[PDB]
């Protein structure tokens, strides 16, 4: 048991692990996106680029929530890092409509984890928990929930002009 | 009652009072340690002015409370701030490890302070807790033990180079 | 099919995606071990950012991989990156010991790599390897053969005065 | 045989001759092009000023194995440069057809040139060609690749529309 262990429960312990492994899945499904739309037959820069920058910010999540640990003086422990569900994304508006219900999901798991740190009357993890999260992901969902959004609106997937106008000009 | 006040107990109102009290004894008990620190028979500057720093951050930590207590309404009562326990303070890492025991204790009764408020519903109150004072604690609480530790692995007490060089290389750097 | 395909060999396109994954898990290695020397008991904050920089590079390695498997007109299948081998590295020598071992055995897959490359007559690729990986993995590894020298010279991992001065002078 | 001349063979030496002018004829095919498109009935500005870049680019390719053969102590011997195929190239995507078609037929040549000169045993030939032409040649042809991708997804060679903002957006 750490010297610096106060108030901090093994549940939320290997929650917090469990957030870790998760962020950085996010992480590699936001890195093969990217390079899905890198490809010369898909050829959409942008669209491309937001989830490069996305996968790297999902990547400092993850080091946030290691950091948290240590913090706590709990004890990292990493998983397998699952290879991504698909290996192709057919179109910018299926890309986006995925990494919308993969934000849900992970916003779901955080919700969890601080209902979780309430039970354990846990506040320092609470507030971590909502001033750095909890927001961001509200905000993500609302972002990812727009793209689609304007991406169907534009007649896509079905024309190929709406996700490249899409991509100069709400991602470039 | 004051015309500002507004879903605030008077148990909070005891409870700020007592961490306003803690915090300031906070604050003495750094004050002792720095100056021990300062002595021609131990002269570690660095140690001395880490823990001067440490006594000022603690001191705006009640100044901090007594700012929230009368945006509450609450009335601030003073209690007699209670010499630290002890005068000669050892060591370096001996200072640090006690250090840590301090802040670990304004951690608890931080925590105690949180769960009354909860149960109280004061989400203003619980909220500033979180806000100003558990991340700010957990931090501390942190380098404090990264501190331990490493004076731990240097070899102190016993070689008095460990505590030499801790000062010279991370109080100083 | 894949319009810029050329002189491209079916198993350089596998080998590269192998190559990728291997990159990924040298990033989580050294994630783990940045972490490692961020925990309250071990507090090598140098070590610990030093580790987090091989950490983003090898990541970078590995884009740089993806961006050329669609330059050359393959494509990409990503697998689970498997765990890092321990999850706690016991110490500052022990940790760069790894390192060192870890950065040989990716140079070696590097090696084998510009084998077949040689044997599918793909210059391209063989320079490609040349010019961003070989030399970086000699400096790497020399780098890193460097500083293990340097902490047994000091009495690592006996002496917990060599790690913490090392830290200090060599790694900040 | 020149003062300078070591370890340059003959094959090497009119093998060069005839990159000259193939990049030299590149160039040609590359202006052509570009005027096309200044054509007040076709109107593509950036498509003009795209293939005139490229023009210029493809005439300093010429110029640097002008220069080796002289650093090599070769012998320079010029052909006609070739009218191009056609006059008349239709449209964007065709003309981008075109180019990409040209690109990876120059590239054959590059390749079948190194090949040679690793027979010859010929490694300051080798890295030259590696050095400066494969990687110029991989990314162009990427570049190539994504540009006829985007322009038939958007509804070329069928809509002017598509062509119009490729010009503007990609292009300008
Ligand atoms: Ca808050
Ligand atoms: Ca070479
Ligand atoms: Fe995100
Ligand atoms: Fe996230
Ligand atoms: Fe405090
Ligand atoms: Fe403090
Ligand atoms: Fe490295
Ligand atoms: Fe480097
Ligand atoms: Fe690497
Ligand atoms: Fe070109
Ligand atoms: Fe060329």
Redesign the interface.
């Known amino acids: 048991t750490?010297?610096?262990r106060?108030?901090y429960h093994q549940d939320s312990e290997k929650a917090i692990n469990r957030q870790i492994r998760l962020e950085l899945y996010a992480s590699?499904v936001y890195?093969?996106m990217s390079?899905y739309f890198?490809?010369?037959?898909?050829?959409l820069?942008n669209f491309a680029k937001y989830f490069?920058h996305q996968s790297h910010e999902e990547?400092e999540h993850a080091?946030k929530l290691?950091?948290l640990?240590?913090?706590?003086?709990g004890?990292?422990?990493?998983?397998?890092?699952?290879?991504?569900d698909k290996?192709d994304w057919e179109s910018g508006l299926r890309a986006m409509e995925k990494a919308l219900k993969l934000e849900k999901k992970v916003n779901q798991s955080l919700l969890e984890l601080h209902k979780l740190a309430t039970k354990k009357?846990d506040?320092?993890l609470?507030?971590?928990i909502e001033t750095h999260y909890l927001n961001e992901q509200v905000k993500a969902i609302k972002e990812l929930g727009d793209h689609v959004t304007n991406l169907r609106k534009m007649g896509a997937p079905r024309?190929?002009?709406a996700?490249?106008?899409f991509d100069?000009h709400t991602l470039g």
């Open positions: 750490s010297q610096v106060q108030n590699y890195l093969s390079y890198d490809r010369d037959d898909v050829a820069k490069l990547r080091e290691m950091k640990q240590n913090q706590r003086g004890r990292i422990f990493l998983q397998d890092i699952q290879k991504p290996d009357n506040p320092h609470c507030d971590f024309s190929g002009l996700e490249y106008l100069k």
